[PDB]
Design a binder for this molecule. Structure first.
Ligand SMILES: [Cl-]
Ligand SMILES: [Cl-]
Ligand SMILES: [Mg+2]
Ligand SMILES: [Mg+2]
Ligand code: NA
Ligand code: NA
Ligand code: NA
Ligand code: NA
Lengths: 1003, 1000
C-alpha cells in the first residue's frame, strides 16, 4: 500500500522541526511582520503552476515530475489556494464525521485507510530559476501548508512526502538544483491517513493552502534557536534573558555565533558571542543568562518588543548569516490556581479563530490584519488558533499589536469518537500525534504572544495525549499546556471544558481542592442571531477568581459568497456544492462574530460592551457619583479620557464634561459628576459615559470608543411634550370575522397594507431551531399559522370591544384574546389586548404583541430606545437609549440563514414615515420592543438562503410587549428562564398616532 | 409618448458636462516619471478609484435601484465587484459573441434592430457605487473624475449630484468635480447600461460585454491648468536629418496675476536640447500659446528599429516664476507620409509587417500592464513592426509601450456598424449620426495625437461609406498634416490615403498595383486570417509585397484569440466561444472569435512561427553551393546588418556538425551583400547536409536579449544518394498478416510481439481544420464523398511466403465507389516491410482529398518520437518556410496543439524518416523513397473530428499514426483565400511507398 495509506508515513527526508530561521540581508526587517519575504535570500514560488486534477490515483499523470514530461497542455492553478475554490472537485462541509465515510464514496471509516478509487489527485508543477547570487549556497524548499498528503520532486528527483497540513515541511534541495531552469512538482492527495487527525468542524478542502518558497543560507547555518525572556518571580520587574542556538552544516575552519538584543529605539541592551569549531555537523550553543533591570514588559495592552539579531561569522569575523525575531519579556503561568500574566491574574476575553477566506484555508495579509484590528477594537485580548497552527504571519501580528494566543496542534479525530476506538487510545497513532505536536511547538516556541499551548481538539483522551503532554512539559517551562478532552485528569494545566453553563462554572469553582482555573476553550456559540446570556457568564468571571473567562466559539463565518442566475448573492454552507447526497452538516459552519468578509454581526457589539475594560455603576443618582472599576491588567485609567454628558429624552445636552481619572489596574475609584437640572419637559434623562485612549495605536486611533456606559435618570413622568400633535381625522374599521383592526385612516387615506393581529411567533433564529423552549414548540402549537375568530363584538362611535378565539392551522384553540380599540380626542388609537393561552397546547411563545404591514414607501424610521443596532433582552447591555434615525433596509441584518432580525429593546416610542412625512407614531405604556423588516414573516421563516428573500411591496411591523432572548442553543445553553416569554394571561397596549410631518427638502 | 425616451435611446445624447477631448495632461511632481509607461499613476496628484465597488445588477431598468446614487442610500446589503472588469466575467449577466450582427437584434430579447433604439425591458443595468476620501494636499485645487472606458452608456454622480452621461466606450470621459466635492467621505456612482444607441457603432466582431472596462481615477491640477497641447516632431523633407519641433499649448482656468508657460525638451541622458518660455495673462478663461518653431541638427530619429525618444517637460509658472504644474510626454522625431505612391517612414519606403490586435484577457476587454507588455514583447520577438488597434482606441498604456519599444501603430476610431450593412440603411449615410461619428473621431485624435508610434489614423471599420465618413475624413485632414488617414470601406474613393481592402488574394494585389493612375499604396487592413490551424499561403503574399513597390504588406487578422478558459465537472479545461454561455438560443457566431496568432493566454500557435520566419528582416539565398557563397538581403529600414551576429554551420543528416563559424557583415538597409562561407567536405556516409544560418543582435533590448534568434535560413546540400548508413539494424524476426477481407495489413510482429493496435489502411481524410470547413476544396467535399467513412474490400488477392499482392475497392458509407487501390506488401532480408500503394480515384465521386497516405494505430506506450525532417513545430506544405530540417526528439503529447476547436494538428513536413518507440526503446522506424509528411496524435481521427471543444477530447489508450505521400496545405478559408492550387492534393492516379523497420 502507498504511503498515504499509512498512519506512520508522516514524512521523509524533511528538515527536523525548528523555529523559522529566514536569512536576512537587512536586520531592520526582522521587526517587520513578513519582512523576511523581502530578503534577497528569499524567493517566493507562489503564483501560476501547471495543474491537473483526477479522481482515482490509477488515472493520474504518473510521470509529470520528470522534467522532460510535457505539461504545456495543462491549465494553470493559483498557488496558494484550495483547488475547490478554483473550479476543481467539490467543497464539502461536515462536522463530527469524515466526508469520505459515506456511501457516495463506497467507503466506511476504517483507520488508517481512506478511499482509493474515490480519492482525488492534484498534480502541481512549475519551472523556476535560482538567483545568480545563490551560487554555491545551501537552498531550502519550504511548503508552509498543503492539505492532506503529497510527494514532492525537484528536477525529477523525489525529495520525500508529507502528512500534516498546518505546519511547514522543508527539504534541502542543494544537491538536486541545476544551472538554469529547474523544476518542482507536488502530487497532492485529497485524503490520506493524516486526514483521520484533521476532522475539524470546517470545510474539507484540498491543495496547496499556504506559501511555497525558497530560501538560501550558507553551508554552515543557524538551524534553530530557543528564546526565554521572563521576569523575576518575586517582583516581576527584572527581565531574565536566556538563549540557545543550534548551528548545522560542515565547517573545517573556526567560526562564531553572536547576538545583540536591541530595544525599539535601536540601542543594544544585551550582547554576547561564543566561538565554535567542530568536524561534526551541528553545534548546540548555550549563552550565559543575562538580566535587564526595569525591563520594558510585554503584554496585550503594551506589546513592548525588543529585537534579537543573531549573526554567524567567519574565522575572520565576517558575517556570513544574519537572522532573528522579536522578543517580549513576560511570564505566563498558573499561580495559586489562577492564570497569570506577569504575576497578574487576567480575565481571558477571547475568541476562537479559523483561517478562512474566499480562497479557502488560504488567508491574505490584509485579512489577517483586519482580523486583529477588529479584535483589538472590540476589546478582545485572546485568540485561540481554532484547532491547528496558523500561518507564521499571524503570530507576528499578535506579537506586534498585543494579543495573547492559545496556539494549538493540528489534531482532531472527532469522527472516530471518544470511545475505545478513539485514536487517542491507539498507540499505532502516537507517531502522528507527536509529529504534529513537535511541529506546532518548534516553529513558534519563541513568540511572546503565545501564552498557552493546546494539544488539540476533541480527539479523545488517553495514552497518546498523556505522552504528548509529558513531552510538552519537558520542553516548556514557561507556558501552561491544556487540552479540553483531558477534562480533569492530570494532563492539562487549565480546566477548559467547552460550552458549560453558568451553573456548571459555579459548581466547578466551588469544588474542594481544585488547583486549576476554569477558562472555557469554547463558549457562547455565535451561530446566526446569537450570543444571548453573555452577561450572566461575565458576572461570574468577574466575581470568581478561578473562573477567568474563555474564548467565544468562532471569530469569522466559514461561508463562501456566490451569485445566482438573477445576480443575487448569498452565503453558502454545507450541501451547497456537488450532487444530491453529498456529505453535509448544513449552516453550522457559520458561527462567527463577523461574516466571511469581516463585516461584524450585531452580537459582536454586545461582545465589545461586555469585554470592555472600564466598567462603571451609578452610586449616587442625585449628585451623579459613579464607581469606576479599571479592568485593564497593566494600564492606569489615566491613559484614557472620560467624555460624559446628560441628555433629555428629547436629545438635548443638559450637561457635559471631560475627565482624566487615575486608577490602578483592578482597582475602583469614585468620580462625582454633580447634580443636573432636569426640565419638566422630559420624562427621563440619560447619564452617558464614553471612554477613548489618549495615545493612538496603529489599529485604534484616539476617536475610537473603547468603553461606555449609560444610566437612566428619572424626570417628569407626567409630561407629554414628546407626543406629536393631531394630524387630522382618524378612523378605524374592525373586521367582523377576525376582530382584527383591518383599517386605520387619516382624513380617508388608508395606512395599513395588512390588518393588525395578535402575533406569538417569530421566524426562527438558528438557536430557536434547537432551543428546548424554541421553535420546535412554537411550530408544534402552530403559532406560525394563526387565525382569529370572533365570538363577541361590541362596537361604538369611537371604540370597539371584541373577544376572539386564536386558532392554529389545525383548528385547535391556541388561546383566547380580548381587544379594545378606542379612539382618543387627539386622534390617537389605543389598542388594549388581553391574551389567555391554552397551556395544554401552548408550551412556549416567541413573543406577545401586535403585527401588521404597511407599504414599503414608509421607509423612514425614528425611535427613542436602545442603540444604533440590533439587541434582544438577553443581549442588550450594548448600545444606548437615545434618539435614532434610520431606514427599514438599514435595520435588516443578512444572517447566512435568513431569520429574525432588526429588533430594538428598551423602546419608548417608534415612528415610521414616507418621503412625504406621512406615517405613524407608536408607543406603549412601558418600554417595549419592535422590529421593522422589508420581508413577510412567512417568506423570512421559509428562506434558508439570502437569495430566496424577495420583497412584495410591504414592510412588516411587530410591536412587542414581550419577546424571548436569543440564547446560544445551536451549541450550548438555550435562553435562560428569566428571558423566556411567559405563557400565562397577560395584558398590554400600544397607541398609534397618525402623523403628517411634511416633505423636507435638503442635501 | 408623453415623455421623451431616456438619453441612452438617442444617438445625440453622446455626452453632457464633460471636458472637451484633449491629450492626457496628468500633473506630475517628478518629471523623471514622464518617460515611464504608466508613470503618471505614481504622482501625488493622481488617485486611483479602481478596486472593490458596491454593485447591483438587474434585467429591466424599471427594476433598478433609482436613488442608489444618493449618499444616504444604503448599499450595505449589496455585493462587491472588481473595477475595472466587464461584469459578465464576474458572475453577472451573459457574455455573448456574435459577429456582423447586433446581439440585441434577436427574438430572445423581443427586439429587431431599429437605430437608435435598443431593447428596454431586456436591457441590463449595472449599478456601481463606492466611497472615497480626497487627499488633504488637494484642498483648493481643481479635481477631475476620469473614466477611461465604460461600455455602452452610463450616468455618473458624485455626492448625489448628476455630473452627466456618456456614449463611446473606448475613450475617456472626464468631469470637473471640484465644486461637488466635500470634506470627509465622498461618494461616486455609475449607472451603466448594457445597450444604448451608441452600441450601434460598436458592432465589432468580438465579445459583447458590459460594465466599467478601464481604470477610473481622480487627478488634480491648480485652478489655472494645462488643458491640452499639440506636439509636432518632424524632419526636413529633403534630407530627413534635421528635426523640426513645433508646440502649441492651451491653458484654461482663471488667474489674477501674471503667469507663463515654458517647455524643456530633454534627450535620453537628461540634457536639454531645446527650451523656450512665453508670458501670459488674460481675463479669458482660455489661452492659446503657440511656440516658435525650433530645429535640431542631426536629431536622434525615432522608428520601430531604433525608438529614440526625447522628453517634453511642460511647466506652468507663477508671476514669481514658481512652477504651479508639471507635465509632459515622450517625443519621437520622424515623418510618416505617402510619398510617390509609397508609405514612407523618415523618407524610407517600409514594408508593413503587422498584426491586428483586440484588447482581451480573462476579465474581458480589460487588459493588465503585464499582458500588454507580453503582447508587445512577443510581437517584437516575432518580427512584427506594426499593430492596428482593431476597431477602437486602446488603453493609454499601450501607446506608451509602442513609443518606448518601437512599434508602428494604426490607431482606429471606435466606429463599426456592421449590423446595419453597407446599403442605403448604412449609418455612414444617415446624416443624423454625424455627431456620433465625429465625437468618436475627435476623441480618438485628441487623446493620442502626440504619440510618435501612431503613424496612421484609421476612421473605423466595416461601417459603410457615405457623408459621415467623408466628413470625419475631411476633419482629420484639417487637423493632421503628419499622418495618412485611412478607411477600408472607402475603398478607392477620395476619403482614404491608403488602399487597404481586406483579405484580397495575391492576384487581386497584382491587379491593383498594375492599374493605371493609382497613387496610393496597397496595404491590407486585414489579411491571412489566423483562425484555428491557419496562415497558409503567406509565402505567396510576401513574394508580392517584397517585389511590388506599391504593395507594402499589411496586418494579419488577430494577434490574440478572444476565448475564455473554463473548467468542466471532470476538471478538464476548454476554450469557450460563441454560444458557450447562456440559455439555448442565445445569439452566437460560434468559434469565429478565436482568430489569433496566439491563444488567449498568449501562448503561440504553430503559425506564429511561420509569421516570424516570413517577417524576418534578414534573408539569404545560396548563390554558390560549392564554396557556400550566400546572398544576404537586409530588409531592415534603418539598421545595418553589422548590428547583428551570424552564427553558421553545416550539419550532416546524422546531426554531426561538419563545419561552423561566426561572421559579422556590413550591409545598409535594403541592400544586399554576398558572403563566402567556404567549401565543406561531406562524408560519403550522409545522403545530405544542411547549411544553417542563424542571426541575433549584438546589443540586447529590454524585450529581446542577445540569445534570441531574430532570423534564420537553411539550404540543403546534396550528399551520397546511395548510402544507407542511417538505417536501423535488424532487431529480430519480422512477420505480417494481410486481412482477407480488407486487404489491410492487420498484423506486424517482431519476434511474435504485435506492434499494431489497428490495421494499416489507405487514408484520404483528415479531421477538418476550421479552414477546411469553409474551403471551396475542403471537408464539405471530403465528407460528401464519404472519405471519412472508408472501407476496403478485396477483389483480388495473391500471396507468396514473404509477400502479398492485393487490389481492393474503396467504398464510402453509402457503398459508392471512391476508387480502386492496389497494395503490395513485401518483407526485406533485414526484416523491413515495404508497403507499395497505387490509388485510382473515381473522379465522379471524389472532387477533393485531404491527403493520400497510410494510417494505423499503436498502443499509447509508444510515446517516444524521433524524426529527421522540417522540425520542432507544426508545418504544412503551404506553411513550412519556418523551422529547419534536422534531428528532433519529442513525445506524441508534446506534438498535439490545442486549437480552441479540436482539429488536425502535429503534422511535420520534409520528413526523411520518423521513429516511434516506448521507454524500452521498442517500436518502428518509418521511411519512404522521398520526403514525406507525418503526424502522430493521442486521439482517434473519429473523435478529433467530432469534438468541437477541447474537453471533449478523450484518449482510448491508442495513438494515431499518419504517413502521407501527399497532404493539402491549410490556407486561410475561414475568411479570405482557401488553399492555393499548387497545394491541393491531386485527385488522380498515384503510387507511393512506405517501409517499416521494426526496432528494438
Ligand atoms: Cl500540522
Ligand atoms: Cl470611444
Ligand atoms: Mg469537532
Ligand atoms: Mg465587423
Ligand atoms: Na461549526
Ligand atoms: Na428562515
Ligand atoms: Na472573428
Ligand atoms: Na473537430
Amino acid at each position: 500500500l502507498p504511503e498515504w495509506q499509512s498512519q506512520y508515513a508522516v514524512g521523509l527526508n524533511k528538515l527536523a522541526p525548528h523555529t523559522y530561521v529566514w536569512p536576512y540581508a537587512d536586520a531592520s526587517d526582522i521587526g517587520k511582520p513578513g519582512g523576511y519575504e523581502q530578503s534577497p535570500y528569499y524567493m517566493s514560488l507562489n503564483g501560476k503552476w501547471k495543474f491537473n486534477w483526477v479522481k482515482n490515483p490509477d488515472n493520474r499523470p504518473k510521470d509529470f515530475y520528470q522534467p522532460s514530461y510535457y505539461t504545456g497542455g495543462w491549465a494553470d492553478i493559483n498557488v496558494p489556494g484550495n483547488w475547490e475554490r478554483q473550479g476543481y472537485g467539490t467543497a464539502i462541509y461536515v462536522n463530527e464525521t469524515y466526508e469520505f465515510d459515506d456511501k457516495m464514496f463506497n467507503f466506511k471509516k476504517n483507520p488508517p485507510l481512506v478511499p482509493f478509487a474515490e480519492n482525488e489527485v492534484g498534480s502541481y508543477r512549475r519551472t523556476f530559476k535560482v538567483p545568480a547570487d545563490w551560487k554555491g549556497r545551501r537552498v531550502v524548499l519550504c511548503c508552509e501548508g498543503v492539505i492532506s498528503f503529497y510527494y514532492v520532486w525537484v528536477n525529477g528527483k523525489l525529495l520525500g512526502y508529507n502528512q500534516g497540513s498546518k505546519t511547514a515541511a522543508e527539504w534541502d534541495i542543494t544537491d538536486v538544483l541545476s544551472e538554469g531552469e529547474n523544476v518542482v512538482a507536488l502530487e497532492v492527495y485529497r485524503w490520506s491517513s493524516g486526514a483521520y487527525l484533521e476532522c475539524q468542524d470546517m470545510w474539507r478542502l484540498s491543495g496547496i493552502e499556504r506559501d511555497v518558497y525558497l530560501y538560501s543560507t550558507p553551508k554552515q547555518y543557524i538551524a534553530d534557536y530557543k528564546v526565554s525572556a521572563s521576569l523575576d518571580k518575586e517582583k516581576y520587574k527584572e527581565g531574565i534573558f536566556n538563549l540557545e542556538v543550534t548551528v548545522e552544516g560542515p565547517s573545517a575552519t573556526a567560526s562564531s555565533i553572536a547576538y545583540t538584543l536591541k530595544d525599539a529605539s535601536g540601542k543594544a541592551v544585551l550582547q554576547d558571542a561564543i566561538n565554535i569549531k567542530s568536524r561534526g555537523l551541528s553545534n548546540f550553543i548555550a549563552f550565559d543568562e543575562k538580566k535587564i533591570a526595569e525591563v520594558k514588559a510585554w503584554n496585550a495592552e503594551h506589546p513592548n518588543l525588543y529585537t534579537l539579531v543573531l549573526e554567524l561569522k567567519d574565522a575572520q569575523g565576517k558575517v556570513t548569516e544574519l537572522t532573528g525575531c522579536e522578543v517580549g519579556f513576560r511570564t505566563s503561568e498558573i499561580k495559586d490556581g489562577r492564570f497569570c500574566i506577569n504575576g497578574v491574574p487576567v480575565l481571558v476575553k477571547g475568541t476562537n479563530r479559523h483561517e478562512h477566506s474566499q480562497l479557502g484555508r488560504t488567508v491574505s495579509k490584509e485579512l489577517m490584519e483586519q482580523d486583529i484590528r477588529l479584535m483589538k477594537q472590540h476589546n478582545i485580548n485572546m485568540v485561540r488558533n481554532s484547532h491547528y497552527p496558523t500561518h507564521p504571519y499571524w503570530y507576528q501580528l499578535c506579537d506586534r499589536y498585543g494579543l495573547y494566543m492559545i496556539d494549538e496542534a493540528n489534531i482532531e479525530s472527532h469522527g472516530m469518537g471518544y470511545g475505545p476506538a478513539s485514536l487517542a487510545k491507539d498507540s499505532t497513532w502516537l507517531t502522528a500525534h507527536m509529529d504534529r505536536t513537535h511541529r506546532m511547538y518548534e516553529r513558534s516556541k519563541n513568540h511572546p504572544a503565545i501564552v498557552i499551548w493546546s494539544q488539540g481538539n476533541e480527539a479523545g483522551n488517553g495514552i497518546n495525549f498523556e505522552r504528548t503532554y509529558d513531552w510538552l512539559k519537558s520542553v516548556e517551562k514557561g507556558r501552561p499546556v491544556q487540552y479540553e478532552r483531558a477534562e480533569l485528569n492530570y494532563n492539562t494545566d487549565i480546566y477548559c471544558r467547552m460550552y458549560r453553563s453558568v451553573d456548571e462554572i459555579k459548581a466547578y469553582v466551588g469544588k474542594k481542592d481544585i488547583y486549576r482555573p476554569f477558562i472555557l476553550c469554547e463558549y457562547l456559540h455565535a451561530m446566526g442571531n446569537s450570543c444571548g446570556g453573555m452577561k450572566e457568564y461575565w458576572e461570574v468571571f468577574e466575581n470568581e477568581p478561578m473562573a477567568q473567562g474563555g474564548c467565544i466559539w468562532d471569530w469569522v463565518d466559514q461561508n463562501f459568497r456566490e451569485i445566482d442566475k438573477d445576480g443575487k448573492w448569498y452565503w453558502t454552507y454545507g450541501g451547497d456544492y456537488g450532487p444530491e447526497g453529498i456529505p453535509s452538516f448544513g449552516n453550522f459552519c457559520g458561527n462567527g462574530l463577523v461574516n466571511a468578509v469581516r463585516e461584524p454581526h450585531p452580537h459582536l457589539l454586545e461582545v465589545k460592551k461586555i469585554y470592555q475594560n472600564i466598567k462603571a455603576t451609578l452610586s449616587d443618582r442625585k449628585n451623579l457619583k459613579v464607581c469606576i472599576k479599571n479592568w485593564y491588567d497593566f494600564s492606569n485609567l489615566n491613559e484614557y479620557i472620560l467624555r460624559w454628558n446628560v441628555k433629555g429624552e428629547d436629545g438635548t445636552v443638559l450637561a457635559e464634561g471631560t475627565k482624566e481619572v487615575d486608577c490602578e489596574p483592578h482597582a475602583t475609584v469614585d468620580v462625582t459628576l454633580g447634580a443636573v437640572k432636569l426640565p419638566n419637559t422630559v420624562r427621563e434623562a440619560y447619564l452617558n459615559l464614553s471612554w477613548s485612549r489618549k495615545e493612538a495605536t496603529p489599529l485604534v486611533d484616539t476617536d475610537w470608543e473603547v468603553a461606555y456606559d449609560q444610566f437612566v435618570l428619572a424626570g417628569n413622568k407626567n409630561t407629554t411634550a414628546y407626543r406629536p400633535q393631531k394630524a387630522g381625522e382618524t378612523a378605524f374599521v374592525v373586521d367582523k370575522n377576525t376582530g382584527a383592526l383591518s383599517s386605520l385612516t387619516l382624513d380617508g387615506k388608508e395606512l395599513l397594507a395588512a390588518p393588525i393581529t395578535l402575533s406569538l411567533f417569530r421566524p426562527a433564529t438558528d438557536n430557536d431551531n434547537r432551543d428546548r423552549n424554541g421553535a420546535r414548540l412554537w411550530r408544534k402549537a402552530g403559532l406560525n399559522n394563526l387565525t382569529q375568530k370572533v365570538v363577541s363584538l361590541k362596537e361604538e362611535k369611537t371604540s370597539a370591544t371584541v373577544r376572539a378565539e386564536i386558532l392554529n392551522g389545525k383548528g385547535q384553540k391556541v388561546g383566547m384574546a380580548d381587544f379594545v380599540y378606542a379612539l382618543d380626542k387627539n386622534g390617537a388609537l389605543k389598542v388594549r389586548t388581553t391574551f389567555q393561552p391554552d397551556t395544554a397546547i401552548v408550551k412556549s411563545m416567541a413573543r406577545l404583541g401586535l403585527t401588521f404591514r404597511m407599504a414599503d414607501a414608509y421607509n423612514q424610521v425614528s425611535y427613542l430606545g436602545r442603540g444604533d443596532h440590533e439587541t434582544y433582552i438577553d443581549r442588550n447591555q450594548s448600545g444606548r437609549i437615545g434618539l435614532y434615525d434610520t431606514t427599514v433596509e438599514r435595520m435588516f441584518h443578512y444572517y447566512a440563514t435568513p431569520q429574525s432580525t432588526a429588533n430594538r429593546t428598551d423602546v419608548r416610542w417608534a415612528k415610521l414615515t414616507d418621503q412625504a412625512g406621512e406615517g405613524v407614531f407608536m408607543e406603549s405604556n412601558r418600554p417595549f420592543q419592535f422590529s421593522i423588516i422589508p420581508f413577510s414573516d412567512v417568506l423570512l421563516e421559509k428562506a434558508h438562503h439570502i437569495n430566496e428573500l424577495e420583497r412584495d411591496g410591504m414592510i412588516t411591523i411587530h410591536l412587542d410587549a414581550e419577546q424571548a432572548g436569543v440564547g446560544t442553543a445551536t451549541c450550548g445553553p438555550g435562553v435562560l428562564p428569566q428571558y423566556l416569554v411567559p405563557v400565562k394571561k397577560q395584558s398590554f397596549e400600544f397607541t398609534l398616532y397618525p402623523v403628517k410631518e411634511g416633505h423636507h427638502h435638503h442635501h
